[PDB]
Amino acid sequence: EADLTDWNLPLAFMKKRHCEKIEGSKSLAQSWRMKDRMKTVSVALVLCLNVGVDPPDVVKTTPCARLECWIDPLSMGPQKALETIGANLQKQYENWQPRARYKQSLDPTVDEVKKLCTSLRRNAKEERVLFHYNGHGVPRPTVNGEVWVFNKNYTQYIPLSIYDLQTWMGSPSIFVYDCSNAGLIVKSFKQFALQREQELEVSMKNCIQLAACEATELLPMIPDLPADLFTSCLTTPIKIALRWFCMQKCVSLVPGVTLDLIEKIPGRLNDRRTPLGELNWIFTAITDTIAWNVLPRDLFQKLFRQDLLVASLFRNFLLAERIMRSYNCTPVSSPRLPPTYMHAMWQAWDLAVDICLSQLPTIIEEGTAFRHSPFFAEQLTAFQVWLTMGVENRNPPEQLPIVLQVLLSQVHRLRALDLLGRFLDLGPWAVSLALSVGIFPYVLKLLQSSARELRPLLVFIWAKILAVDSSCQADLVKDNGHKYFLSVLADPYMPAEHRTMTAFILAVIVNSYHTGQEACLQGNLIAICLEQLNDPHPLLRQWVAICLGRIWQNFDSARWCGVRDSAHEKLYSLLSDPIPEVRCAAVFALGTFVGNSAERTDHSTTIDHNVAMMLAQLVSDGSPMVRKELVVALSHLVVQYESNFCTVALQFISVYTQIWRVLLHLAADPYPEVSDVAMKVLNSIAYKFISATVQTGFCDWSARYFAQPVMKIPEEHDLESQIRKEREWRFLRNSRVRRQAQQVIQKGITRLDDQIFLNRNPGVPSVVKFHPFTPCIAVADKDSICFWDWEKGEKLDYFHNGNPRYTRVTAMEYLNGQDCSLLLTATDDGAIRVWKNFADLEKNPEMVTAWQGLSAGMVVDWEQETGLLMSSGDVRIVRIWDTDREMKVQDIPTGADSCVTSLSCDSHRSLIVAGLGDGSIRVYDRRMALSECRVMTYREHTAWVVKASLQKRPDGHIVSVSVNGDVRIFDPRMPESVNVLQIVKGLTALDIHPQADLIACGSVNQFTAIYNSSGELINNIKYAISCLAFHPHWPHLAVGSNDYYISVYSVE
Amino acid sequence: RVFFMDDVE
């Protein structure tokens, strides 16, 4: 079948740089940064336990609850018990905040608390101060807003107003209440804050309160639990959690587990390898997950991420709420947290505790080895499952804080980093979510690790983070992570993808950041980039060039280092790189290198001139983006040498003159954007300030690549995707069209006199080109390009090609005819421009690319199979433009004075033919050397060769016709004509059909002869015919007379 | 930092 031919055809000018507009992605407002870092410098422990005496308000039961801070006061005397309880509570709080000035107050008086609070506030005027109160030994707070303490003789409880309590304290502070009606204390505190606010007109959000109970509710009195329950939850969450779990009915599932075994649990809270440390780690992760999933982002950042002590207190407050809900006790906090007792993660916590403590009897008795919990592994498996179909922006995964926690240890660090990188690959929203969770400091700390297996994952994560947010450069430079990135980039054994990832990271780090530029310069990054400049990888070279450009941006020391290393000479090689992106990056780097001369010695001037001349040979470039980067480079040149350019400009109203000529050439550029930039630059020189400098968005556009997902399969490879289905339908339609055309041709050719439609055009139809498959013909005028249809018979579009008056559209072609067709329109002056969306309903005309070629009119011959494009005209030169590399590949001399009137080629062979104005039809074979490219040259005409077209068949027969109208069919293997025919004395235009040997000619007397290769008369249509065109498949012919009428003919 | 990252070199 013919389907394979369509599939294996490169699509010229169909890439990211052509489709997407070259601009930088707007940076989002990254609010993941922490606004301030508070610290609990001091902690106040006020313990009104009243050991040995029961408050009158509550009549305790005979067994009651005698456990305070895991201590039984009655067994060791009143004063000793009180002191040891204070010390134990201080130890418990130190477990979370070891560095803080703890000042215990044991049954104090109002004056004692006053002095303590005032001294602590004076010590820490702008830092958090924790105030812990235990009202177990004193009567309940009253509605008036007072807290009861003891007098000197301990004979009566004297009140302490909350108003004065917070007067002694400061705005930055957190209060922890362990009383019966602590909700009353919280309410009174809020009322006093409102009173202060009212009085101020003629400290509510800053203060944080944690209360054991609501105002009405009472603390539990069950003997099993400790009397001091809320503080036990806040400060020793694991012990109380295990005790509570052992008190539930779930123990029935696990016989042989008792509180006695819990008391003898091995391990400590720090070593995560031990059972108790693992349980603490799991509890921390579960509480963090619950807080992140339930609380809003702002409140979560304020509470669980501001400082260690408050975050731990609230993480344990979640457990306190869950535990005390079962006893008709509702803890209260100043910022009302939505309830978390029903969260699904508590079930996972229960399961993890069950699995951990199911092995405890074996550990205690048999002394077996403790197997690590599969909790983290299972959670990471769940995260991977979510990522499997997490492409859509659905609800964020609940395991992000779990990934954060598992990153801390090394048991699952590699898998955690891999999953995190996969998540960040999803897009900028994923990285924003990750940074909000708070991975940034820990990922930054990871760079200190010397483990060689972490380099790829870490560089992937950091490249993503820097792509979404560029403010991390300061943090990276502060932590000396750029040394880690340099070490990564200095390893040839590392895969190229990670090396270019690190190159992008370094480029972002030194992007307009003097500190980072200096740090990298002291890191010999210039040498590292130079050694890895010629690597066989387009993206790596592009980003190394971009990094080199950004290193010496307004940095004289970097420029000197590059000069010592001969950076410019080595970078010159990239100017010929086939990939346009690398060429643009090299041009940008050279321009930045030039822009910071800063009036150095004559050597600097010589090097600047050398770079200017090396860039001045880049004008004849196919890529408009590279030409724009070049224009920016010459603008930097002008800024460096403003006075010289001003003198040169005033001279005409020899180095700088050449650059002025280059800028003038770039000013009359086919691409509107490049022309506008060049004209702005020149006008900036005419009126001779800093505002004239303009920076293109190429660097940011390239940086946008790392923001997009890379791991996932491209949409093109997707077999069931809509785009591939549409392409398959288009190819099926093309195959059907070819089959129908072949069937029609096999039936012979009959007289074609049918006039499908007759219309009128605003201008003279110059060149008419048929779209091979879709029913559209592009008719080009002097100042417009019309697109008509021969089925609907309606004008579709009317362009303004953009060329000046003196110019004219001579040649036209249909790039990518099989699908996603473009229109190449080449004017007589050399300007070649490509159009897209030229016959669409919902899309306006678009310009893909354009580039001044060369520099009879001008002739163009597109070759889809090999992707080459050949241009010729009045010049004695046949240029060979390659759309893949967007550079002129070969330059075969014409070797004749006359202009090239026509141009054609034979598919699958190098048989470039060219009709000449004098009459000679020359054949060129590009396989051999340029001097021997000429193959044959036969001269049997003395007139302009209207069309020396070639037949695509293997036995190519060059049908050359001149103004004299004599047809002479030639062959590449015979220096003499095979068939000589004479048709019209005066000929104006003609076209030839490769599939059907039908030669359509014109006449001055309105005649239109459509004859055969044998010269047999077929038709003589009676109406200057200046444009004929044959549909490449159908036997369709379009005739446009001197009058602006367009007609298409067909055989029945 | 809120948490304690260990085993970092």
Author numbering:
A (entry chain E): 18 to 219, 236 to 686, 806 to 840, 950 to 1116, 1125 to 1292, 1303 to 1331
B (entry chain G): 399 to 407
Q: What did the published study say regarding this structure?
A:
pmcMechanistic target of rapamycin (mTOR, also known as mammalian TOR) is an essential serine/threonine protein kinase that responds to nutrients, growth factors, and cellular energy to promote cell growth. mTOR nucleates two distinct complexes, mTORC1 and mTORC2, each characterized by specific subunits, targets, downstream signaling pathways, and functions. mTORC1 contains mTOR, regulatory-associated protein of mTOR (RAPTOR), and mammalian lethal with SEC13 protein 8 (mLST8). RAPTOR binds mTORC1 substrates, including the well-characterized substrates ribosomal protein S6 kinase 1 (S6K1) and 4E binding protein 1 (4E-BP1), through a five-amino acid motif termed TOS. RAPTOR binds the LST2 TOS sequence to present LST2 to the kinase catalytic site in mTOR for phosphorylation of LST2 S670. mTORC1-dependent phosphorylation at S670 leads to monoubiquitination and stabilization of LST2.
To characterize the binding of LST2 to mTORC1, we performed cryo-EM single-particle analysis on mTORC1 in complex with full-length LST2. Interestingly, density representing LST2 was observed only in the RAPTOR TOS-binding pocket, suggesting that mTORC1 recognizes LST2 solely through the TOS sequence. Our cryo-EM data suggest that mTORC1 recognizes LST2 exclusively through the TOS sequence and that RAPTOR binds the LST2 and 4E-BP1 TOS sequences in a highly similar manner. Next, we performed a coimmunoprecipitation experiment with purified RAPTOR and full-length LST2 (WT and F401A), to determine whether the TOS motif in full-length LST2 is exposed and accessible for binding. RAPTOR clearly bound LST2-WT whereas the binding of RAPTOR to LST2-F401A was reduced 9-fold. Binding of the full-length protein to RAPTOR revealed that substitution of the first phenylalanine in the TOS motif with an alanine (F401A) is sufficient to reduce the RAPTOR–LST2 interaction approximately 9-fold. Thus, the consensus phenylalanine in the LST2 TOS motif is critical for binding to RAPTOR, as also demonstrated previously for 4E-BP1 (19).
